[PDB]
Amino acid sequence: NDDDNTEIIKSFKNFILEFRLDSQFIYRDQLRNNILVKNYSLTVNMEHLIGYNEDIYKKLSDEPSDIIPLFETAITQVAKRISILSRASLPTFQLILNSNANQIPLRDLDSEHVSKIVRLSGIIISTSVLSSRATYLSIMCRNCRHTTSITINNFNVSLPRSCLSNCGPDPYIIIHESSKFIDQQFLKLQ
Amino acid sequence: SLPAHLQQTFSPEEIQFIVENEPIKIFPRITTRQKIRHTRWQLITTDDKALNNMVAMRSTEVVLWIALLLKQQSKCSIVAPQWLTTKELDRKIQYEKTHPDRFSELPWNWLVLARILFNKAKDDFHDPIHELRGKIQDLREIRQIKVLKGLKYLNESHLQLDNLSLLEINELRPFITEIMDKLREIHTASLT
Amino acid sequence: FAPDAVFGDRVRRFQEFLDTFTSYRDSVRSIQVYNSNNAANYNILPHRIIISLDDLREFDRSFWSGILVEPAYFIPPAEKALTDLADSMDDHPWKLSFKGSFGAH
Amino acid sequence: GYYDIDDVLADGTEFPCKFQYDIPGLGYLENNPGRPITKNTKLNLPLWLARILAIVGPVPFVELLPPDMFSTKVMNAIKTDPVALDLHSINSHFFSLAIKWIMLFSEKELANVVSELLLQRAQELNHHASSLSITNIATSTFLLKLEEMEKEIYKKSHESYKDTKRWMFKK
Amino acid sequence: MYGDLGNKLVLEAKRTKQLYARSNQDVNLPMYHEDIIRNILKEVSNLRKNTEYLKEQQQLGMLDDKVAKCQYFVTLLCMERNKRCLLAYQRLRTDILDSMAWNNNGLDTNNLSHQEQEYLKEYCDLITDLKSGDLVDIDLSGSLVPPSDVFIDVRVLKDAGEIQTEYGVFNLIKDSQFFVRQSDVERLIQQGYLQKI
Amino acid sequence: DINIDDILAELDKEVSPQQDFSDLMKSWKNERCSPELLPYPHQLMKRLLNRISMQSQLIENISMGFLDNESKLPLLCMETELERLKFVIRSYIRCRLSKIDKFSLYLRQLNEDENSLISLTDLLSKDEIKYHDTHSLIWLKLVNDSILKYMPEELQAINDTEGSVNMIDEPDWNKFVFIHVNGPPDGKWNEDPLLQENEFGKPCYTVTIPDLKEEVELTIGSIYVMRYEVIRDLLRDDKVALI
Ligand SMILES: [Zn+2]
């Protein structure tokens, strides 16, 4: 299915590169301007994604936990294509969503909304300290020092159970110098 | 007597006004060449002769503001210049990607004229206009990368920018001139 | 890149830095002779040197930015060079410490 | 220029002056007209006055001690991280004052360092000037750290970019 | 110290320049600071009396070649500083008045000093002399946006009845809309009776 | 084969309003971008103003004819032509009046200096002279009554060069400007004495940056950011024009 994922990625790349209203390429402009001020994210209004090609929105809303990382990947590739002269390094870009889907009040959310994109509102009653989550883990086997890696999308991974070619039962460890991390924060919404 | 924002630069409308003085090729949809077998254009800034001798769909060359005036009505079509076709813009894009330092030799008015004609003559292009807009955007983005590289090499001495557009220059002008002026004033002040 | 290959270059570059700014060698020997004298007649100073990041910047900006951005690769050879210098002074690992102008850090 | 307001304010900043003579009557600079200023009185004077008493006097009436804004501490902070530096806190007119100081005493090191400082900050200033809405907090936290000189360059540059974007995409 | 009031005045100058610069319109400039200017001119008179007192006492001549020279230098430089501050303030407000003259009167009064009121009168008279002698074929006070269109649509924003133009009329009915030559209506756009472009 | 293009040239050989408008555009661009007040195009402006007068009379006469074969479209083109041209003259004059405002005391000094290589009536228009003189008097009257009345006679001069700051603002001669190198306006590269071959066999002008004691080769058909004083005589001879 990697060809299918590649076609999802290329579909999103085409959405960034082609979406235009009133003579302005709004997402090319926004992505470039975001790169200049060195915030590596893109704010996408899903009204525009629906208006471009609703098949993409249908894929996104059917399973966002698989589709959102592909959209993020597409944003990285376009970011490089519009800010670096290739044949003469940026992180994984965050996707940010704007929406006007009808709100589900916080009490009505239940088991039928699991893994759906949801829009809600409330009062933030607490905001935890920042915490570090891994995006890229550099990984080493404790016995043979076979090295590998895990590239992580934070939408829901673990260390491998045994060595990927005796080598011990549960052998892998993290190389904390080469591994890449991101800020994560917890909020409570009432 | 001159506003602050016009003191040492041109407004983009003045850049447009400059570009509108360029000749452009049109297909007339009126005939003004009276046969041998009435009001004449009688201009004082530009070539009166071409407009008095138009014949419908014999292509001819006139100043761009007159072509826009005739294209505000249905009385001509503006022939997009040869560089603005898809294949030529793609060649310029390949040049830009192949030479990381040089700017490609697009004409000085390229962004201004692309904007003007994509708005006022969107129907006259042989190629699909969304591709022309896409490739003009590709060129502006790639050229902006090259500009941002070039500004790392600002001097107290001078600078060279071979094929940078009138609009791109006019957009950069206050920044570049002010920064190079201050670098000069730092350097000259240090002299005995 | 494998750090172990360039480790020797980093050791000799920090040794050149120590030679260039001799006040660090003088401080190393000051610590040593103080400890020797306290051992000589029955207080001990530690095997630590505070180096200026400004001196290291003016010496080698590439090494200095290596210390700031990649200390896990640049501190151990710098401390090895310091330990070798202390060992070259007449008659245990020596440690580095830092001062000045960290900027964004 | 003469009527240039940001120059007039820059001339109004104060520098530490050490006097080379005993002079009667000047005690109003020490807030008492009735007494002399002594030799080796160390006194903060406005630059419009200190510039002239530093040259006229033969030994001049005043020697200018190194101001703290050009101390080796500040110069080191400049030479590490130009874009992270809060020049507006150091002195709101630091570039104009550095130009004046470089001219008053020919100091090649300060000229080189200030050239590097301005150039490296000019890159970041252009990045924030070119970015446009369709404003970012990253821009706001950077603009707080700009001198009046750099604020004028940023305003003019950002207006140029904004006006161009307006003309391109609007009618 | 003698220069402090000058700093306060040119801080006023800097703030009014920003007040004019930040907005898109011509903001009507703020009140002329007669109080601070009176304080500075009184300080100048103090400094003049100090020079007179010193130059009288130079006939007694206390270490005059250095001491009286130095005293005279400092009290002269205080007057140079205060002259610079005063002229900076007045030159800024003069520039704004000239800009306003071209932008409006060549086609809030309490805030001006009476010298500035009669200055503005004379500068407007000068502008109207320039667009009356030679070069009168061009209204030199007209717009500096280049003419983008020869015909425009304009919506009547305030009623002004039937008025003539060179070969016709407009009846400026409230919330009527014309389609008309721009050169025949620009005067009314500037006067705020017509809305568009 | 034997080349004959010169033979064919000698077979082939067997002021205009368009040129004046192009010259006005050149003057307007150079004026807008330069720090100096450039010398007034006396004859060009005289003839342009005559044309604007006669063209206005023509458009009016045709309008009277319409009121007394008919198509209005050329008439519309003539109307908007005069609008565009009168805009350029308006913008040009307004700009150099702003320069006269900035440099009023420096221009007065140039008129005072009997050794000046420029007389003010070379540099300025008659209307600009009217403006400079009477604006200078009116500004002088304002600051005389408001400020200089109260100063000592050491300091009542409005233009003191010996002060702790020079009161006379002058053009920033080494201001950086953008230029595009024309070459000679005719294609007579062999006639131009300053034009010369660069390496890689292409023409250029070499100029000296005197502070840096350094030379730079301004190639034809390319754009440079240059100190204005360095390029100034090339600009005077139209060998470069300001972007
Ligand atoms: Zn293993």
Contact D169 A39 (CB under 8 A): no
Distance A151 CA to ligand 1 centre (A): 20
Least Cα separation, residue A163 to chain D (angstroms): 44
Distance A162 CA to ligand 1 centre (A): 8
Least Cα separation, residue D26 to chain F (angstroms): 19
Whether residue F215 contacts residue F209, with contact meaning beta carbons closer than 8 Å, is answered with yes
R_g of chain F, CA atoms, integer Å:
24
**Alpha-carbon distances of A13 from A76, A88, D131, rounded to whole Å:** 9, 23, 22
Interface of D with C (CB under 8 A): 76-77, 79-81, 84-85
Show the DSSP H helices in B121-190 as ranges. Answer: 129-150, 166-190
Strand, coil or helix: E85:
helix
- Per 3-state DSSP, chain A is made up of helix, strand and coil in percentages (nearest 5) of 35, 25, 40
Interface probe for E, chosen from D48, D155, D156 (most Cβ of E below 10 Å), is D48
Q: Residue F61 contacts by C-beta under 8 Å, 6 or more apart in sequence?
A: none
Residue E152 structural domain: 144-197
Distance A168 CA to ligand 1 centre (A): 7
Whether residue C70 contacts residue C22, with contact meaning beta carbons closer than 8 Å, is answered with no
Contact B3 E145 (CB under 8 A): no
Does E115 share its domain with E65? yes
Picking from D1, D3, D52, the nearest residue to F164 by CB comes out as: D52
Name the closest residue on chain F to residue E132, using Cα atoms. F127
Token pair, residue C101, equals: 């102008």
Contact F163 E135 (CB under 8 A): no
What DSSP string describes F35-88? SS-PPP-HHHHHHHHHHHHHHHHHHHHHHHHHH----SHHHHHHHHHHHHHHHH
- Nearest-angstrom CA–CA distance, A123 and B135: 46
Given the DSSP bridges, would you call strands F223-227 and F240-242 parallel, antiparallel or unpaired? unpaired
Distance A145 CA to ligand 1 centre (A): 6
Cα torsion through E43, E44, E47, E53, rounded to 10: -110
Does E74 share its domain with E152? no
Does E109 share its domain with E53? yes
b/e per residue C88-101 (b: at least 16 CB within 10 A): eeeeeebebeeebb
Interface probe for D, chosen from B8, B175, B187 (most Cβ of D below 10 Å), is B175
What DSSP string describes E118-183? HHHHHHHHHHHHHTTSTTTTS-TTS--S----SEEEEEB-S--EEEEETTEEEEE-TT-EEEEEGG
Give backbone dihedrals phi and psi of E154, rounded to 5 degrees, phi first: -140, 130
b/e per residue F160-182 (b: at least 16 CB within 10 A): beebebebbebbbebbbbbbbbb
- Decide if B190 touches E, using CB distance below 8 A: no
- Nearest-angstrom CA–CA distance, B35 and F7: 38
Does E56 share its domain with E17? yes
Given the DSSP bridges, would you call strands F214-219 and D14-19 parallel, antiparallel or unpaired? unpaired
Name the closest residue on chain F to residue D55, using Cα atoms. F164
Does E98 share its domain with E22? yes
Chains C and E touch (3+ CB pairs under 8 A): no
Given the DSSP bridges, would you call strands F176-181 and F240-242 parallel, antiparallel or unpaired? antiparallel
Given the DSSP bridges, would you call strands F176-181 and B60-63 parallel, antiparallel or unpaired? unpaired
Q: Read off the DSSP letter of residue A170.
A: S
b/e per residue D80-94 (b: at least 16 CB within 10 A): bebbebebbebbbbb
Query: At A131, which amino acid appears?
Result: S
- Nearest-angstrom CA–CA distance, E162 and E139: 25
Does E150 share its domain with E124? no
Q: How many domains does chain E have?
A: 2
Token pair, residue F165, equals: 């700051």
- Look up tokens 């060549």; give the residue: E106
Least Cα separation, residue D128 to chain B (angstroms): 12
Q: Cα angle at B171 between D126 and B83, to 5 degrees?
A: 125
Name the closest residue on chain C to residue D85, using Cα atoms. C103
| CA-closest candidate to residue E184, choices F97, F61, F63 | F63
| CA-closest candidate to residue E147, choices E176, E106, E185 | E185
- Nearest-angstrom CA–CA distance, E195 and E159: 12
Indicate the burial class of D20 (C-beta count within 10 angstroms; 0-12, 13-18, 19 or more).
Answer: middle
Q: Cα angle at A83 between A79 and A85, to 5 degrees?
A: 120
Distance D97 CA to ligand 1 centre (A): 64
| CA-closest candidate to residue F85, choices F153, F17, F5 | F17
Q: Cα angle at A121 between A115 and A123, to 5 degrees?
A: 120
Distance A147 CA to ligand 1 centre (A): 8
Longest dimension (CA), chain D: 71
Residues of chain E neighbouring F146 (CB-CB closer than 8 A): 86, 90, 113, 115
Residues of chain D neighbouring A39 (CB-CB closer than 8 A): 136, 138
- Nearest-angstrom CA–CA distance, B185 and D78: 19
Does E25 share its domain with E118? yes
Element (H, E) at A124: strand A124-127
Does E172 share its domain with E123? no
Least Cα separation, residue D75 to chain C (angstroms): 9
| CA-closest candidate to residue F136, choices F161, F155, F111, F117 | F111
Does E134 share its domain with E57? yes
Distance of CA B54 to the CA centre of its chain: 25
Does E42 share its domain with E121? yes
Strand, coil or helix: B15:
helix
Token pair, residue A39, equals: 């915030």
Final residue belonging to a domain, choices E98, E117, E143: E143
Q: Residue F50 contacts by C-beta under 8 Å, 6 or more apart in sequence?
A: none
Interface probe for B, chosen from F90, F223, F224, F242 (most Cβ of B below 10 Å), is F223
Distance of CA F119 to the CA centre of its chain: 17
Domains and CATH numbers, chain F: 15-169 (1.20.58.1030), 170-242 (no CATH)
Contact D118 B186 (CB under 8 A): yes
- Decide if D53 touches F, using CB distance below 8 A: no
Whether residue A190 contacts residue A122, with contact meaning beta carbons closer than 8 Å, is answered with yes
- Nearest-angstrom CA–CA distance, E176 and E194: 10
Does E154 share its domain with E138? no
Q: Read off the DSSP letter of residue B20.
A: T
| CA-closest candidate to residue D158, choices A36, B175, E25 | B175
- Nearest-angstrom CA–CA distance, F76 and A93: 55
Q: How many Cβ atoms from other residues are within 10 Å of residue C25's Cβ?
A: 17
- Per 3-state DSSP, chain D is made up of helix, strand and coil in percentages (nearest 5) of 55, 10, 35
- Nearest-angstrom CA–CA distance, F39 and F236: 10
Neighbours of ion ligand 1 (CB under 5 A): A 141, 143-144, 146, 163, 167
Looking at the DSSP bridge assignments, the partners of residue D46 are: D14
Distance C2 CA to ligand 1 centre (A): 21
Contact A39 D136 (CB under 8 A): yes
Q: Give chain C as a 3 state SS string.
A: CCHHHHHHHHHHHHHHHHHHCCHHHHHHHHHHHHHHHHHHCCCCCCCEEEEEHHHHHHHCHHHHHHHHHCHHHHHHHHHHHHHHHHHHCCCCCCEEEEECCCCCC
Does E51 share its domain with E62? yes
Name the closest residue on chain E to residue B68, using Cα atoms. E149
Give backbone dihedrals phi and psi of B61, rounded to 5 degrees, phi first: -115, 130
Q: Which chains touch C (3 or more CB pairs under 8 A)?
A: D
Q: Read off the DSSP letter of residue E102.
A: I
Element (H, E) at D99: helix D94-104
Contact D115 B186 (CB under 8 A): yes
Query: At A37, which amino acid appears?
Result: V
Residue E16's Cβ-side half-sphere holds a number of Cα atoms within 13 Å equal to: 23
Whether residue F144 contacts residue F199, with contact meaning beta carbons closer than 8 Å, is answered with no
